[PDB]
């Protein structure tokens, strides 16, 4: 009940501008300043700067002096971040964070993930994966789903709507031909497969795709 809620992942093409919000909740937004922190895929954390919430004044860190602005809307108790004319290298997650007196950040947003690229939004296709029953039987069985040929980032994956958690391994997408590939893995005793039903859930906000896939024995 005490939080910063940040806007959904953005897909831009080079040149475009993007504007991301961060909405306070559960605190007097005015009592603290807001800062911003990004992080490119696979890297470390870079401080971008801050804005004083009780005068609107935004101090930027020399790396983002330029195309970055920091505004406000106190009355909706929201901060925003604008980045002008995108570029590849702006590909990253951007964070909002509340600064305290004691000199640390307490409450982080989840980050909004900016994907800078020309590639075209596309949906997955999903394919199930099943144990063929051509050479072995083990106690335990490994069902899989596979999520092929889509852009941009994210696709979520679930097993039994969330219920199958405990022996999954969903894989990082892997870009290729301006397209991504995931896949998922699950391990259920066999005492349960036939039997119980196992279906995986995939979604691709960008393509408005939701799709369920039951995995049907061989």
């Amino acid at each position: 009940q005490i939080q910063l809620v940040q806007s959904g992942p953005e897909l831009k093409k080079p040149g475009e501008t993007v504007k991301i919000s961060c909405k306070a909740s559960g605190y007097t937004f005015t009592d603290f300043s807001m800062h911003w922190v990004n992080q490119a895929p696979g890297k470390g954390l870079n401080w971008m700067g801050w804005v004083n919430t009780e005068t609107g004044e935004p101090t930027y860190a020399d790396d983002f002096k330029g195309r970055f602005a920091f505004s406000l809307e106190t009355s909706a108790s929201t901060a925003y971040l604008q980045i002008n004319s995108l570029k590849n290298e702006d590909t990253a997650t951007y964070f909002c964070a509340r600064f305290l007196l004691r000199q640390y950040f307490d409450v982080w947003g989840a980050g909004t993930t900016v994907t800078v690229s020309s590639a075209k939004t596309t949906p997955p296709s999903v394919y199930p994966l099943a144990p063929g029953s051509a050479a072995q039987t083990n106690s335990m069985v490994t069902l899989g789903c596979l999520v092929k040929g889509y852009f941009p980032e994210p696709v979520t994956v679930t097993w039994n709507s969330g219920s199958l958690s405990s022996g999954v391994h969903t894989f990082p997408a892997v870009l290729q031909s301006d397209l991504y590939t995931l896949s998922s893995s699950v391990t259920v005793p066999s005492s349960t497969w036939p039997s119980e039903t196992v279906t995986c859930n995939v979604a691709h906000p960008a393509s408005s795709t939701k799709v369920d896939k039951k995995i049907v024995p061989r």
Partner: peptide, 9 residues
């Protein structure tokens, strides 16, 4: 664990 392809595909 090996998996062959798949009908709809």
């Amino acid at each position: 664990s090996i998996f062959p392809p798949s009908s709809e595909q």
